[PDB]
């Protein structure tokens, strides 16, 4: 019994992903996040190594489940008549990157470097596990404030990673690439790199670079804040109009701007404590 095992707390948020509550596992007092997803709102379904029909979100979370703390851990799940309930880990204290940037404004480059590197490691983990996130953005990144560790969350818009073209998308439009806007077609890795370019611009400028479809298609990057030449170069590279002109994850991590990254604990000591 789900109701027996967990003590429900406040609602942490709701939207396209469903409704997420703060919770406590009654057995060991472990902090958890309880996510409710309506069955009538689930368009992508999959199957587990045993053969049960579950939402794609559960399939993807199980594929990325490991000791690696860069991606949120699915602790358990339950089926109800009209919904699915996901028990997810909950860092404490925590703050999502959107709220962090809203509160603190544009981030110091040393902080953005540490955060961006951790996001890159989290996305590389997903891809290694055969999972494409499809909604990389500030709102889908939690900061574990004590450890300085970032956690990629919400696989509700995700898909199994494939090398062929994707012709469907239900992630965030302003983080979506020009090939999706113009042609309704994209390849997983190169679309992920575009979103990473939007995210990095967001970290160092305090806001996203493009609002309208026209701006995405033009892809002209204007820096509203003082940003180093190496960081601007990396951003402009990730935001190349042609998917084939975008860097690989290896090229991003070998970029001069990405050198001498702080450890997560060093990041918490300097910037979060
Ligand atoms: C509900 C999400 C999108 N946003 C959000 C905003 C603020 C907070 C504060 N804590 N918190 C939180 C803490 N631990 C875990 C989670 C969480 C974990 C997983 C998921 C998920 O969609 O996979 C959503 C949320 N959320 C928030 C979530």
Nearest to 180 by CA among 195, 168, 193: 168
Q: What is the dihedral of CA 174, 156, 200, 197, to 10 degrees?
A: -60
E-state strands within the chain: 6-15, 18-25, 31-38, 45-47, 53-55, 74-79, 83-89, 94-96, 131-132, 141-144, 149-152, 159-160
For residue 255, how far is its CA from the centre of ligand 1 (angstroms)?
31
Task: Give the span between the Cα atoms of 101 and 10, in whole angstroms.
Answer: 23
Give binding residues for ATP as ranges.
Answer: 12-20, 35, 89, 96
93 torsion bin: left (phi>0), alpha (psi -120 to 50), beta (else): beta
Method: X-ray
Pocket test for ligand 1, best of 153, 155, 156, 158 (most atoms within 8 A of CB): 153
The radius of gyration of the chain from alpha carbons, rounded to an integer in Å, stands at 19
Angle between helices 188-205 and 97-104 (to 10 degrees): 30
Task: Give the span between the Cα atoms of 202 and 133, in whole angstroms.
Answer: 19
DSSP 72: P
The answer to whether residues 90 and 35 touch, using CB atoms and an 8 Å cutoff, is no
- Give me the number of domains the chain comprises: 2
Helix (H, G, I), strand (E, B) or coil at 57: helix
Angle between helices 229-238 and 188-205 (to 10 degrees): 150
The answer to whether residues 20 and 32 touch, using CB atoms and an 8 Å cutoff, is no
Residues 114, 7 share a domain: no
CATH code, domain carrying 70: 3.30.200.20
Q: Read off the tokens for 6.
A: 């967990």
Residues 106, 57 share a domain: no
Residue with tokens 């956690």: 151
Q: Read off the tokens for 177.
A: 């690439």
Residue where a domain stops, chosen among 59, 92, 125: 92
């Amino acid at each position: 019994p789900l109701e027996s095992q967990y003590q429900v707390g406040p609602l942490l948020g709701s939207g396209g992903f469903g409704s997420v509550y703060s919770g406590i596992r009654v057995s060991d007092n472990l902090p958890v996040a309880i996510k409710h997803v309506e069955k009538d709102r689930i368009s992508d379904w999959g199957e587990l190594p045993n053969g049960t029909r579950v939402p794609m979100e559960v399939v993807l979370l199980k594929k990325v489940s490991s000791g690696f703390s860069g991606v949120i851990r699915l602790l358990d799940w339950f089926e109800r008549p009209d919904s699915f309930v996901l028990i997810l880990e909950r860092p404490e204290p925590v703050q999502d990157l959107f709220d962090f940037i809203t509160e603190r404004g544009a981030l110091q480059e040393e902080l953005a470097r540490s955060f961006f590197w951790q996001v890159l490691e989290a996305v590389r983990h997903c891809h290694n596990c055969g999972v494409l996130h499809r909604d990389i953005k500030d709102e889908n990144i939690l900061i574990d404030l004590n450890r300085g560790e970032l956690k990629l969350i919400d696989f509700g818009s995700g898909a199994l990673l494939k090398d062929t073209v994707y012709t469907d998308f239900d992630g965030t439009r302003v983080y979506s690439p020009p090939e999706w806007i113009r042609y309704h077609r994209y390849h997983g890795r190169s679309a992920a790199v575009w979103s990473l370019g939007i995210l990095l611009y967001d970290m160092v400028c305090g806001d996203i670079p493009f609002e309208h479809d026209e701006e995405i298609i033009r892809g002209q990057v204007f820096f509203r804040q003082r940003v180093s030449s190496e960081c601007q170069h990396l951003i402009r590279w990730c935001l190349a109009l042609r998917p084939s002109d975008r860097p690989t994850f290896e090229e991003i991590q070998n970029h001069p701007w990405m050198q001498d990254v702080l450890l997560p604990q060093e990041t918490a000591e300097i910037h979060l404590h």
